[model samples]
Target: SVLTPLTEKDYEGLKRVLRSLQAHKMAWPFLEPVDPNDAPDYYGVIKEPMDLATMEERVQRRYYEKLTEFVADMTAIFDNCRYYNPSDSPFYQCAEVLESFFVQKLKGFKA
Candidate 1:
């Protein structure tokens, strides 16, 4: 098969990173799926919503077969935030900080 599943070690590494991200103080905004009632237009603006809780569920379910897929979802969280919120907004700033932290941690992943 051309597509291969992540090895046990790589899966563990990714899970650990996810745990760290979930525990970060700046992760609050991205922790849960955006509530439609709270932001009526959010769904209209964001076609595909990504959040840490969803990612955590996917990880536990092994929905991502490779590290790159995980990275894309992580990046999507930031991209969606930036696209929806003004740069000066606190949400945008949180995304920026969290993304930078994620990128730095990604450097340590060998697999």
Candidate 2:
């Protein structure tokens, strides 16, 4: 899969739109669904509190489910992806093969 470079400024633009959305500020005529991966940046950011006391649980749950699927898909494709990580981040990378290399030595087992 090819990764398209998202300019930092463009990300800020989307953040503003998302904040407007959360605050029920009006939609733009150009409003359209954003990429699922991009949506997380908005949801992840810290924002001012609002009276969401009327928000629907079912709708939020459904969105959360979809986000979980997106995360799983991203993890699968991360096998070969490269990006910079700061020193404060702790992480590990590992690759597993379907059949163990030790299994290949047992020839009679297949016959």
Candidate 3:
């Protein structure tokens, strides 16, 4: 059953895993901009996100991972089954809000 959440230790462990996934996703060549002008806009110290915090802050500024956005994402993907091609997955999974990460819930589920 889905409990409230993991304890501190468990949370941290999972956070590490999340960070790793975040890194791998961001580092992908296709995700990287080919044309300088075509790249997604960036703000903050660096013009482009060189690290996780950079990316995280960008998301925060846009209310991307905020409660409202998360609700929309969960609804769209899970409840609505609003079909989007997997190619778009790269864009969706980037931030905390719709942060898809292509995460297959390998741990627990039932049909």
Per model, how many backbone clashes are there?
A: 0, 0, 2
Candidate 1's residue-wise lDDT over 1-111, tens digit each? 326668877788999999899999999999999988878999989998999999999998989987778999999999999999999999999999999999888988753
Clashing pairs in 1: none
- lDDT by residue (14-103, candidate 3, tens digit) is 445334545564434223223336443323222322333433443444434233332343333322111221335654333323234424
Q: Evaluate residue 54 in candidate 2 and report its C-alpha lDDT on the 0 to 100 scale.
A: 13
Error of 3 at 106 (Å): 5.8
What residue pairs clash in candidate 3, if any at all?
A: 65-97, 93-100
Question: Which model scores highest in TM-score?
Answer: 1
Ranking by TM-score: 1, 3, 2
TM per candidate: 0.92, 0.21, 0.31
> What value does the lDDT take at residue 5 in candidate 2?
37
Model 2 ranges off by over 4 Å: 1-3, 25-111
| All-Cα superposition RMSD per candidate | 2.1, 20.1, 9.6
Candidate 1 Cα deviation (angstroms), residue 88:
0.6
Report clash pairs, candidate 2.
none
